[PDB]
Write a protein that binds this DNA or RNA. Structure first.
Ligand SMILES: [Zn+2]
Lengths: 86, 244
RNA sequence: CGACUCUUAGCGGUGGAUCACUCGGCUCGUGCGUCGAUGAAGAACGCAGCUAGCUGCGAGAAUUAAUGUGAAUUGCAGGACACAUUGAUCAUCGACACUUCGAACGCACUUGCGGCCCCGGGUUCCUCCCGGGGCUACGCCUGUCUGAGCGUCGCU
RNA sequence: CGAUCCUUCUGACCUUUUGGGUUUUAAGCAGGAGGUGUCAGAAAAGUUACCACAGGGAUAACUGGCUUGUGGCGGCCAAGCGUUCAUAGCGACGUCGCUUUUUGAUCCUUCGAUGUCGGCUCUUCCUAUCAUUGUGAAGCAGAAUUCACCAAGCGUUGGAUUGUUCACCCACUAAUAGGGAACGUGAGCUGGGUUUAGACCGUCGUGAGACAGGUUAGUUUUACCCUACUGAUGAUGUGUUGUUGCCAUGGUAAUCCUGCUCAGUACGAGAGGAACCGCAGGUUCAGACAUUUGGUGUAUGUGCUUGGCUGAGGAGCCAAUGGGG
RNA sequence: UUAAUUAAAACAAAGCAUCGCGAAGGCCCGCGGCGGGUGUUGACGCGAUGUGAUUUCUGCCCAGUGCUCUGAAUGUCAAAGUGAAGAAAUUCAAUGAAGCGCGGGUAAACGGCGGGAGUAACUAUGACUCUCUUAAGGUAGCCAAAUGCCUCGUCAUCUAAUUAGUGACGCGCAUGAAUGGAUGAACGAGAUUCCCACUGUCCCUACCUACUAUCCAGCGAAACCACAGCCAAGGGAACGGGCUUGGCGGAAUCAGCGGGGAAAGAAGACCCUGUUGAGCUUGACUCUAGUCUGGCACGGUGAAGAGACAUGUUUUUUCACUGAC
RNA sequence: GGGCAGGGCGCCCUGGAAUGGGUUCGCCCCGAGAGAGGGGCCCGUGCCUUGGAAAGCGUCGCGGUUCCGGCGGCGUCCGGUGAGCUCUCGCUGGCCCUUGAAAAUCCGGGGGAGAGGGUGUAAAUCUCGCGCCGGGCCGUACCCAUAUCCGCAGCAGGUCUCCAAGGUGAACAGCCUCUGGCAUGUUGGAACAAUGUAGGUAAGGGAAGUCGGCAAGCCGGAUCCGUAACUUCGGGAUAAGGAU
RNA sequence: GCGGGCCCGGGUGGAGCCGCCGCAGGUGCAGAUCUUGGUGGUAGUAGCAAAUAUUCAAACGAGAACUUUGAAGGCCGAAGUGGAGAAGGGUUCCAUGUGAACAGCAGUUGAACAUGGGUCAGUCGGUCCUGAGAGAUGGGCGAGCGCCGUUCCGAAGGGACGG
RNA sequence: AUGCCUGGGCAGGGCGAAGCCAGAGGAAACUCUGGUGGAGGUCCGUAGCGGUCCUGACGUGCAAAUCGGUCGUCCGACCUGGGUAUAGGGGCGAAAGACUAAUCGAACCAUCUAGUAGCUGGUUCCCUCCGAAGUUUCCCUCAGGAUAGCUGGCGCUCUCGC
RNA sequence: GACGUCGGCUACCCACCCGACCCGUCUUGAAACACGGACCAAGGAGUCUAACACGUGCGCGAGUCGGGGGCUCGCACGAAA
RNA sequence: CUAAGGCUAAAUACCGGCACGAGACCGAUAGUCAACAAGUACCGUAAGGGAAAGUUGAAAAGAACUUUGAAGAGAGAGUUCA
RNA sequence: CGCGACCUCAGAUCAGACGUGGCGACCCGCUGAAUUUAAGCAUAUUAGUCAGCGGAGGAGAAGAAACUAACCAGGAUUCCCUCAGUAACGGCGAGUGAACAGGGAAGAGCCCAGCGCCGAAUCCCCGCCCCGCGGCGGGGCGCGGGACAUGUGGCGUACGGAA
């Protein structure tokens, strides 16, 4: 009864897709993610999970702004100028 | 070991009272100029049944003498109160059943209900199903009165606080035997989750100090000091005498 | 001599062991040492003629502009180009642009309900309706405006 | 009769107490004491049947091993029992042995598991022989009887009670003799009670809990592998096949009782009461077979019926074999 | 009610009886807050227990451990405060809260409720009598019970036979009165005894049907595997497939089969060791939340009175106000 | 939408009743106004009518090689029923030491603060009948279970609901049949050996087997008689036992 | 060569390798119920046995017991093996084509594979309201992330008619 | 597992309580007879819920708990969907140490952590030479250490068939 | 004795006689009815740092030393010397 | 010495980020989990867990064409030093 | 019964700016154990360590004595050697454990309140003109506002200062 019979009635789901981390962790009843802590302002992270911390770090994603920041710093962070025209 | 039953009642969330179908708090009318100096008249519109309460309540309509409005109050119905009845509240109100007036004005030996233990708390004493308080004697100096409570204790009370003349409607409720598990289940379902009580002797020695052993026995004296930590204080709490 | 079984050898089967390669790791050392409300990290969804994944990009979506170089990209067609023309591809990238969540900001998170101004359709401001554009989150600093006090006061 | 550390006492015109000086205090040196009895010297109450882990056959509860105290069985001497008489049958006081079908002692094998009592079924083996075959002996006149010998071929039952081994009773019978095979036999069966977890009672403990003190409910997994066994194709030789046969080898099988005659005879004072050969048959067991009797029966053979369905008659079907002769 | 070995006599239940609490309260949660649950509540209520329908009762004991009551008539009693001598650190003295001692109550609180002799005109039992002892020494009831070692107790019935069942006796290892006793209509997938009918449980097995098992076509695993598998005896590490001495042995297989491989499984659940643990209990060793009490600060104003020191100080007791809270 | 059957009224008017009356399956009502007459209101999901016969269906016959959502004749009728099944509405009762939800939204009523034009017009229409414009965003397929979900799978397990034909029958019991669904549930063929799993039958005995009546078997529905001990007087009880 | 091991011959292989003097090491396997991977006896063996049942003819097709059609016999027997939903799945729905792999035999079949198509709302529901409940501001606590609480130590309505 | 909110569902039959009607008896109190009525934590029994017995089937199964027959209940302490609250020395428990995602006498994930073990198991090439002990005493010591003993290696000081 | 005859100790297969129980481990005692073990390939377990003690080799020697820092190089060889 | 006030680079650390150089280091069961569409596939409701997987050939010159078979598969022929 | 100053206190989608989060190898401020050792174990040890919270930079922190020393004295902070496994702590057991001086790398010193002197001699915001504006400044002109006397600016701070 506690096994195969009990596995039949898994009809309603408790976790849904979070809109901040994208993982399927947002708990419906508690309104909390448990993977990033969406209602909390600060991202949830712990030092006892090094692999979990490295899974979502600064280098994991696109860095669409960080890469251009690095390039601008490399070239001198200049603005408002153009190369000499032909 | 485990947290014994009784400690878990303090946190709640299971043992909380079922108050959705209850009609509301049964409070006396707020003290104001009218009740302080003269009297205010109200009409008993209807008598209703409050779930989880033996005594029936009575809705009484007054008129507020400050704005053009009709106030409604939920008094505790004294025995004999009927619909379409005028009830008078205040220092100058007559001494009739179903009239809340200060205990200082009423004479000695008066039987009252829904007595205010302090001036302005809207009635707290002797208001369960049929209980009543007795005005023993008045002390004009220091403005104090003596009241015999249904438990038998004689308490010194202020003469300013009010009380409703008459006993509470619904006496003799405990005379009828329950006769069933079902009647008790339905009685406690409307009040709280406290009816099914398991004996600590029958419990395991980890959920109750009286549990354990190859024979169903307490093992230690049931009478325990009242200065005991929660979890151990069980049985007879600071019993003076325990005999028949 | 049969069939079956045991050993050895040749060849042929499953297997990927050993060796030789290595656009990958590990360690040490040097310089720099830079995120974000002008919207960070991350996530979601889309973008190629044929395009699933990786990578790249953001409705200007396999990239726009400019500079440098100088005849390609390529799996196939299409081809723009006259490579005596800012001119194919690449690198640099300083200009432009950068969908939706996300500190995430009108209220909530369903992608639902709104308010204050402007414009166009509708009107001939005529309030509806439709579409577009800008504001509307919290705390706090300076200053400004409007306010409350049987707080302290001076005149009438 | 007592180490470290700590405390306490005694002694020095004893040392330091920190920049110098004085005085209290404190820290030092030496000699005794306070104590560690688990006495080369931890500061220390229980339960677990709710249990867990690393190990042990160094170490227990099974079997099997050495021994036989104990249990069982058998001899040697002979004071006596036996009406007389030690040895018909017994046998004290002593003494010598056999058996592991009882309990004991040891821990030798097994704790990276050998399934822990009974009962049912089944096979074989032992004699320390209950009865049957052949005989010896008497305190054997017959009958009855116990003692002893070759002797395990064939038998050693049905039940009330108890889980029982054991134990007692009822009835029959020739007799209801004693045992072994890992205290035979759980991938053979049952689980009745030992022996998980739930509970009840009595005693003990303050308590959790304990009880060779009682009661109730409590999952018995797997063979298709090798060998053994029961059967079945087969196999090397005889040139090939067929025929009718021989035989070495193994297995082996029959057992017991009743009635009539002998015979109311032998014997015996009497009561009682045989035996041999013959005749009729029965108990158990073994090998077959269906003429009869009985059983099965789906020839789904033939009737009879309930509900429904082919319109009805007829003929049928469905209802896990519709039911019933 | 123990999902997945225990559906019960267990739990629960109405009924019965105790205990705390009148709200700055009783019980309880909470690291924390003018916090929270009971409480949208008020003794016919909430919270904590014991027994567990109805009837009949609820005997005695406060000695022990608990619980509770008051009490300057008070032994111990920490911090703080006061006085003392000293150069001071200081030690001493007085004072001294709660709790422990001291005195009552409470057993429907935990619990408990004896042992020797003598004695009635046959014996026997024994009314009755004496002594020692506790806080009383088991009262009414009940029983060889679910409770009794002896025990398969004694008697009667139930059977041909009964360690079982039922009815009486009390000598009760060790029954017993809300740790409740006795009884009890109805009911119970609760545990037992007997009788009627019934039947393959059996005597004693037999036959029939369906689906497998069998063979074939197709598809096709798994556990296990030191090497492999014929026995008697011997020794061995104390029960050998291998070794020794013998018996002997013959390809490849099929359907059964459960004697053996001390067959497969889980680094044995039992027992012991470990200076390995965990659940639970307390009269084990250290402590801790909580709780009670004392001292300091928040903590003020007014009015009287008293003791002590001393010849102004402290202790201050009581009564009033609110401006703190 | 309009009208009418048919229900309900704790709605009104005349009148005052014992010789009590009216009335239900039961109840219940009446000088605080019953019976008897005349009226009023609510639901009218039912009947007629617009919709609406134009369309749909059952038939007979044609145009069209083919495409072709075609063309036409007729019918779609008259009655009675039932503790019959389901749904809905309305009265009436019994039970509670159970009293059986909130809010959004809409409406009615007490008042006249206020508006109107002044003798042909106006303010208002909780708008009376019409006429004009708009209603944005998201899901819309399928399975919903012996194959579309969860159990490692096309797993004899589990997963919340609606519709509910005929016969026998007390019945939504079991069995047979109609509409609808399917190929017997991860394969077929050939024989019917032993062990089995699931069904049965057995002469005579009837628990002698076994720890134990384990299992199986016996009785079984309805009608008519009859029914003890005990008891809490309610039950036991379908007691037991007989006939059809 | 006692031995650890080593030198030649032959075949495959196609790009690096070794001798001596010294140095350094993650330096030699038969076991650890060793880790990873592969392969055997078992073995063409156990098995493809829960819910009564299939048969004949034709069509496509190379190929038919499993596909389709027609006929016959059956079962689910209206609390069904029927017709629609909610949760859940997310293209499993439809048409065409294939038989590489899966459907523990097969398949011309499928929920398999490859191509293309499919969900049309003012009226059906979300959207609105509140229930048990969750959770901000004010306030309090907290070293701190935050927590306590939903009316509690709040200047809490930015609304409206008339003038 | 429990509390709350909001919805759904539960054939057919037996017993026949209160209340009411009629008849008969009575002097009254009232009592008997025949009906109506359908109450019950009422009984048989379907759906539903649960799981006693066969200790049946299976037990490398259909299934990491299923199937058959027989079973208890089926108007109330009944069953159930969704939402919600209680989170680990905590919750919840009509109390079985039962449930808390196939785990519950203290859930799961990560880290401390390569935690410790006087206890198991294993420990990799050749040849040559030498080659043991289970004994002493001490230790909360008895499956272990220390200490002597047994052993190996490195040598060194000397004598000599010189 | 020399065109189907020689030698091949070792390794391929077969036959005979004798001997011969399966490896590792705990153990006084293992072939054990003690435990792990179907087979094969790859990986696989006494390392490193620090503190000591002893012995050996080298340099200097009542002396010995490079720790740290500085001077030469832009580091190929060098983070050396 | 002058507390209960305050500012300040240098020699100092850097297993993260950008760009480089080097090795007595490992060479696909080794080296980071990841040499390859690696925190990817996949598993669990979730916190989280987490792989396996390199090599034709110098150049695709990747086997035209005939033939058996429905096809998978072959037999010839051809490319390549192979 | 009003108006006008000031002190306390609110509303703003008032004008102009600022903080929120991420990474976190290094750093700073808190909280913070148990495995382990002591052959047990409770003080100790692991250990101001893991885990948890908050806050920045390219470095951070610290930093120029209320110092070290007792010498014929030295003279900010930070890092290396040494002091030193030393003094010292510890069931004085296991174990723990600095600092001074010396030699080097580097080396840089300073500023307020108060006390006092100067006509608030000071600072912020808005308007106009000129330069320049992609890290919004400088000067001039404004009876234009505000802050400030409950104290801004210059001299001045222990090494003395002011007149
Ligand atoms: Zn998230």
């Amino acid at each position: 009864t506690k096994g195969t019979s009990s596995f039949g009635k898994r009809r309603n789901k408790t976790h849904t897709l979070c809109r901040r981390c994208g993982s399927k962790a947002y708990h419906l009843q508690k309104s909390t993610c448990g993977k990033c802590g969406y209602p909390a302002k600060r991202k949830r992270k712990y030092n006892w999970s090094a692999k979990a911390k490295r899974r979502n770090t600064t280098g994991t994603g696109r860095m669409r702004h960080l890469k251009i920041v690095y390039r601008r710093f490399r070239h001198g962070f200049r603005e408002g100028t153009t190369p000499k025209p032909k | 070991g485990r947290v014994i039953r009784g400690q878990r009642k303090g946190a709640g969330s299971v043992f909380r009272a079922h108050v959705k179908h209850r009609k509301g708090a049964a409070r006396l009318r707020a003290v104001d100029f009218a009740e302080r100096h003269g009297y205010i008249k109200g009409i008993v519109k209807d008598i209703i049944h409050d779930p989880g309460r033996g005594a029936p309540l009575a809705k009484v309509v007054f008129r507020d003498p400050y704005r053009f409005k009709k106030r409604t109050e939920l008094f505790i119905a004294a025995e004999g109160i009927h619909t379409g009845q005028f009830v008078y509240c205040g220092k100058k109100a007559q001494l009739n059943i179903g009239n809340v007036l200060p205990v200082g004005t009423m004479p000695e030996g008066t039987i009252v209900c829904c007595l205010e233990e302090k001036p302005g708390d809207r009635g707290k004493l002797a208001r369960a199903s049929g209980n009543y308080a007795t005005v023993i004697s008045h002390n004009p100096e220091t403005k104090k009165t003596r009241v015999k409570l249904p438990s038998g204790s004689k308490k010194v009370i202020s003469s300013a606080n009010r009380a409703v003349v008459g006993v509470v409607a619904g006496g003799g409720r405990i005379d009828k035997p329950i006769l069933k598990a079902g009647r008790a289940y339905h009685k406690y379902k409307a009040k709280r989750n406290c009816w099914p009580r398991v004996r600590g002797v029958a419990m395991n020695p980890v959920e109750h100090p009286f549990g354990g052993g190859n024979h169903q026995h307490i093992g230690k004296p049931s009478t325990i000091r009242r200065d005991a930590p929660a979890g151990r204080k069980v049985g007879l709490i600071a019993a003076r005498r325990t005999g028949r």
